[PDB]
């Protein structure tokens, strides 16, 4: 017998003690080892309500990731709330590792196993576990990277689809690789991302058709972001410690709805912090080839307002609230207190 409750979680990982990589270093000091034989109890005839949009597990993961970046990715110059902090900004080893979120004694995590669960409402197939699956704290905008896939159909998630101010999370059921490179040899900040256009446009077509199910068969249109900071108008992410900003205009044109798509990218030293606390400047890129190959497993979208009297709905890539990134992985979990 249980009830919804919030409590302080702990984390578990397979971090290596001898690694200089910062996620490994952080988890070594902040997490415990994983359980090799974890127990999972599938509940019979239990109906539980979930709400991915009001889930304190998300706030707690955000707190960890902020602490990790605070300790590991200090900028040379930090501009915050009128203040100016300077410090050493060495180059680091950076590659996110899976982090498990776990309940202490007296509490348990309920997990929704409904295969096309949208993140809110009743779940029929519920199990109880001590820990979530391993979640890589990948920070990005526009495209969700290296995440878990939907098991059956593509899923559309939103706190309120009817409200265009609410972010939409698209959960893909098939990965599309994105290959990002700053080549060895020039403009040391010039880079690019390569994507299979045949694969991408097929998935995007599938996304279009799913969006139709939720928008009364209205015509679905993609357009590039309207305005805002570069972190939002561009697909921004971190590869090997370096901040990449990629132009996704070619990804979100409605015309291809086959060759390789080459997005122009740029490494930026000066960024608007996702922690929402001002600006930071980092050192120039390391030398040599900088390359990250990632699976696109999700998309963050914002819907255009003012389209009620037309047959079109317009969607633009978005993001910037990194909590939505954690939601995309934590949607199926909630914490309960046990008697």
Ligand X SMILES: CC1(C)O[C@@H](CN)[C@H](CNC(=O)C(=O)Nc2ccc(Cl)c(F)c2)O1
Ligand Y SMILES: *[C@@H]1O[C@H](CO)[C@@H](O)[C@H](O)[C@H]1NC(C)=O
- Which residues contribute to the site for ligand X (CB under 6 A)? 139-141, 228-229, 231-232, 236-238, 243, 271-272, 274, 276, 320-322
Instruction: Compute the least distance from the CB of residue 75 to ligand Y, in Å.
Output: 19
- How far, in Å, CA of 319 to CA of 272, rounded? 13
184 binds ligand Y (CB under 6 A): no
| Token code pair at residue 128 | 């109880």
Q: Which stretch binds ligand Y (CB under 6 A): 15-23, 45-53, 195-203, 301-309?
A: 195-203
93 binds ligand Y (CB under 6 A): no
Q: Which is nearer to ligand X, 147 or 320 (CB)?
A: 320
* Torsion sign (Cα): 112, 116, 117, 122: negative
Instruction: Compute the least distance from the CB of residue 179 to ligand Y, in Å.
Output: 4
| Token code pair at residue 20 | 């200089």
Phi first, then psi: give them for residue 118, nearest 5 degrees. -90, -5
CA gyration radius, the chain: 21
**If contact means CB under 5 to 8 A according to the sort of partner, which of ligand X, ligand Y, none does residue 4 touch?**
none
Counting residues that bind ligand Y (by CB under 6 A) gives: 50
Phi first, then psi: give them for residue 221, nearest 5 degrees. -125, 135
Instruction: Compute the least distance from the CB of residue 28 to ligand X, in Å.
Output: 23
- How far, in Å, CA of 83 to CA of 194, rounded? 39
* Nearest-CB residue for ligand X: 320
Q: Which is nearer to ligand X, 201 or 302 (CB)?
A: 302
Strand order in the sheet with 10-13: 31-33, 10-13, 100-102
121 binds ligand Y (CB under 6 A): yes
Instruction: Compute the least distance from the CB of residue 81 to ligand Y, in Å.
Output: 27
CB 23 within 8 A of CB 97: yes
Q: Count of CB atoms within 10 A of residue 242's CB? A: 23
Instruction: Compute the least distance from the CB of residue 226 to ligand X, in Å.
Output: 11
Instruction: Compute the least distance from the CB of residue 279 to ligand X, in Å.
Output: 9
26 binds ligand Y (CB under 6 A): no
Q: Which is nearer to ligand Y, 103 or 142 (CB)?
A: 142
CB 322 within 8 A of CB 274: yes
146 binds ligand Y (CB under 6 A): yes
**If contact means CB under 5 to 8 A according to the sort of partner, which of ligand Y, ligand X, none does residue 145 touch?**
ligand Y
253 binds ligand Y (CB under 6 A): yes
174 binds ligand Y (CB under 6 A): yes
From candidates 34, 72, 275, 295, binder to ligand Y by CB under 6 A? 295
Instruction: Compute the least distance from the CB of residue 74 to ligand Y, in Å.
Output: 19
Instruction: Compute the least distance from the CB of residue 135 to ligand Y, in Å.
Output: 11
- How far, in Å, CA of 335 to CA of 56, rounded? 9
From candidates 109, 234, 300, 301, binder to ligand Y by CB under 6 A? 234
294 binds ligand Y (CB under 6 A): yes
| Token code pair at residue 324 | 């939505």
| Token code pair at residue 237 | 């992410």
Distances (CA, A) of 138 to 22, 94, 240, 303: 13, 11, 12, 24
* Torsion sign (Cα): 59, 235, 178, 221: positive
Query: 3-class DSSP state for residue 170?
Result: strand
- How far, in Å, CA of 65 to CA of 93, rounded? 16
- How far, in Å, CA of 331 to CA of 336, rounded? 15
| Token code pair at residue 257 | 């709805």
Residues that bind ligand Y (CB under 6 A): 95-96, 114-115, 118, 120-121, 124-125, 138, 145-146, 149, 153-154, 156-158, 160-163, 173-175, 179, 181, 194, 196, 198-199, 206, 210, 213, 216-217, 233-234, 237, 239, 247, 249-250, 253, 255-256, 292-295
């Amino acid at each position: 017998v249980w009830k919804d409750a919030d409590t302080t979680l702990f984390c578990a990982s397979d971090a290596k003690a001898h690694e200089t990589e910062v996620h490994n270093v952080w988890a070594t000091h902040a997490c415990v080892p994983t359980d090799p034989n974890p127990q999972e109890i599938h509940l019979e005839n239990v109906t539980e309500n979930f709400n991915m949009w009001k889930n304190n597990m998300v706030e707690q993961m955000q707190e960890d990731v902020i602490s990790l970046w605070d300790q590991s990715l200090q900028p040379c110059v930090k501009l915050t709330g009128g203040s100016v902090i300077k410090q050493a900004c060495p180059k680091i080893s950076f590659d996110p590792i899976p982090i498990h979120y776990c309940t202490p004694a007296g509490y348990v995590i309920l997990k929704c196993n409904d295969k096309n669960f949208n993140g809110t409402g009743p779940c029929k197939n519920v199990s109880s576990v001590q820990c979530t699956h391993g979640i890589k704290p990948v920070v990005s905008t526009q495209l969700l990277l290296n995440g878990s896939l939907a098991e059956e159909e593509i899923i559309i998630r939103s706190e309120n689809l009817t409200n265009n101010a609410k972010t939409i999370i698209v959960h893909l059921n098939k990965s599309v690789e994105i290959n990002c490179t700053r080549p060895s040899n020039g403009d040391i900040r010039k880079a690019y991302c390569e994507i299979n256009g045949t694969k991408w446009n097929k998935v995007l077509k599938q996304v279009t058709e799913k969006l139709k199910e939720h928008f009364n068969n209205k015509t679905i249109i993609f357009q590039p972001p309207s305005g805002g900071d570069l972190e939002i108008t561009m697909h921004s992410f971190n590869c090997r410690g370096e901040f990449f900003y990629c132009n996704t205009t070619q990804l979100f044109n409605n015309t291809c709805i086959n060759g390789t798509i080459t997005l122009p990218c740029k490494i930026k030293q000066i960024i608007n912090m996702w922690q929402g606390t001002g600006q930071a400047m980092y050192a120039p890129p390391i030398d040599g080839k900088i390359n990250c190959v990632s699976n696109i497993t999700g998309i963050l979208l914002t819907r255009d307002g003012g389209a009620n009297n037309t047959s079109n709905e317009t969607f633009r890539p978005g993001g910037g609230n990194i909590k939505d990134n954690w939601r995309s992985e934590l949607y199926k979990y909630k914490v309960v207190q046990i008697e």
